[PDB]
Amino acid sequence: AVGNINELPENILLELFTHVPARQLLLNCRLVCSLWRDLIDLVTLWKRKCLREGFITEDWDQPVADWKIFYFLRSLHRNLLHNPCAEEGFEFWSLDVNGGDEWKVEDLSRDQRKEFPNDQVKKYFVTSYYTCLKSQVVDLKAEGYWEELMDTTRPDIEVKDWFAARPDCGSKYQLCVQLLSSAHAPLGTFQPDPATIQQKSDAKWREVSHTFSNYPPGVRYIWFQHGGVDTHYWAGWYGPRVTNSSITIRPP
Amino acid sequence: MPSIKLQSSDGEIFEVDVEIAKQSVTIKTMLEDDPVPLPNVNAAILKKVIQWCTHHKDDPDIPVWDQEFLKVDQGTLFELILAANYLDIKGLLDVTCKTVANMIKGKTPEEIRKTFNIKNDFTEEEEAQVRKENQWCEE
């Protein structure tokens, strides 16, 4: 007979901890006693929660400074931008400027669907003949990134976006992404160099990409805005098309 | 039909459909003209194991059934986990381990200690050191 949970083998205790939500393991269980604290501070517990949930496999071959951190961040990882391809119209986006005949939503060709290294981009947003811009603000707390995680760990923040514009297009693609404080005060801004945007304006789908690292403490929101600003020479009925926008937070 | 014989730790022999008693990867391997003996599993515990396995022989969030079956005292749970571990029956290892993990959910350190009758090992300065290391993870 086993007359106490702590007379179980270490390997089994690890196995049990595996099924305790991680936040709770850390806050409550490291306090229960020193065995539990020692067991929960082993790499192997987290290493194998990660395995039971697909975040890694047997061939994992990269140094990980802290597995607890790694674990949480992989567990929270997903696109924080809602309705990034236009599966539900303009829901979640502020048409900050909506000139001309306005922002539209339309279907991608089956040929253009391949240009994404996902099978699951079936639509895009497209701008009119005057400037059109839209926005979405990400609320980090509300998406599971509590404050001290942001401040303590400063995990990398990766932003992507895809657009297609002719070199000749009547409105130029534009992209601004800012990290914001609890006051909504900027703590780092990104806009791609306009030269390398014009370089990407052949008529094909191009990605643009950036990672914020070592940003300051205080980051509570990210503001993301994009669209086309009118050049003032007519070249058609629509400007840049954009889709498959994303923001994620990756293990740094 | 055909059936293999299994001896528990305390004498009692048992027979079981050979393919039901191969949810254990341990015995599965041993088959590869006596009774196979099981040092770590006693009668009370071996009977529930074959039971859990017979119910689960036809099978491709803890199922209702598994929850009622497992409404036993801590001590027999623990021995259930152990047999599962020793016999290497993943399915059973998982629900038992979960069921115990569900008793840790929602509780303070003192409340956990009390559920399992664990003595606080810790000095108060060791406790304070642990809260410090848990700073990054609090609100």
Numbering used by the authors:
A (entry chain A): 2 to 253
B (entry chain B): 1 to 32, 42 to 69, 84 to 162
Per the authors:
The structure of the human Skp1–FBG3 complex was determined by the molecular replacement method at a resolution of 2.6 Å. The FBG3 structure consists of an N-terminal 310 helix (310−1), an F-box domain (residues 9–50), a linker domain (residues 51–78), and SBD (residues 79–255). SBD is composed of a 10-stranded antiparallel β-sandwich (β1–β10), with three α-helices (α6, α7, and α8) and one 310-helix (310−3). Although the overall structure of the SBD of FBG3 resembles that of Fbs1, FBG3 has two additional α-helices (α6 and α8) and one 310-helix (310−3). The overall spatial arrangement of Skp1 and FBG3 is highly analogous to those of previously reported Skp1–F-box protein complexes, e.g., Skp1–Skp2, Skp1–Cdc4, Skp1–β-TrCP1, Skp1–Fbx4, and Skp1–Fbxl3-CRY. However, the comparison of the substrate-binding pocket of Fbs1 (Phe177, located in the loop β3-β4, and Tyr279 and Trp280, located in the loop β9-β10) and the corresponding residues of FBG3 (Tyr130, Tyr234, and Trp235) are not well superposed. The side chains of Tyr234 and Trp235 in FBG3 are oriented in opposite directions to those of Tyr279 and Trp280 in Fbs1. Although the sequence similarity between FBG3 and Fbs1 is high, i.e., 133 out of 255 residues in FBG3 are identical with those in Fbs1, four loops (β2-β3, β5-β6, β7-β8, and β9-β10) exhibit different conformations. The hydrogen bond network in FBG3 is found between the loops β5-β6 (residues Asp169, Cys170, and Gly171) and β9-β10 (residues Thr232 and Tyr234), whereas Fbs1 has only a single hydrogen bond between the loops β5-β6 (Gly218) and β9-β10 (Ser277), suggesting that the interaction of these two loops in FBG3 is tighter than that in Fbs1. The carbohydrate-binding pocket is formed by the residues in the loops β3-β4 and β9-β10 in Fbs1, whereas distinct hydrogen-bond networks among the four loops β2-β3, β5-β6, β7-β8, and β9-β10 in FBG3 prevent it from forming the carbohydrate-binding pocket shown in Fbs1.
The SCF complex, one of the best characterized E3 enzymes, contains four subunits: Skp1, Cul1, RING-finger protein (Rbx1), and F-box protein. F-box proteins provide substrate specificity to the SCF complex, and consist of the common F-box domain interacting with Skp1, a linker region, and a substrate-binding domain (SBD). Fbs proteins recognize aberrant N-linked glycoproteins for the endoplasmic reticulum (ER)-associated degradation system, resulting in degradation by the proteasome. The sugar-binding activity of FBG3/FBXO44 has not been detected, although SBD in FBG3 has a 52%, 68%, and 43% sequence identity to that in Fbs1, Fbs2, and Fbs3, respectively.
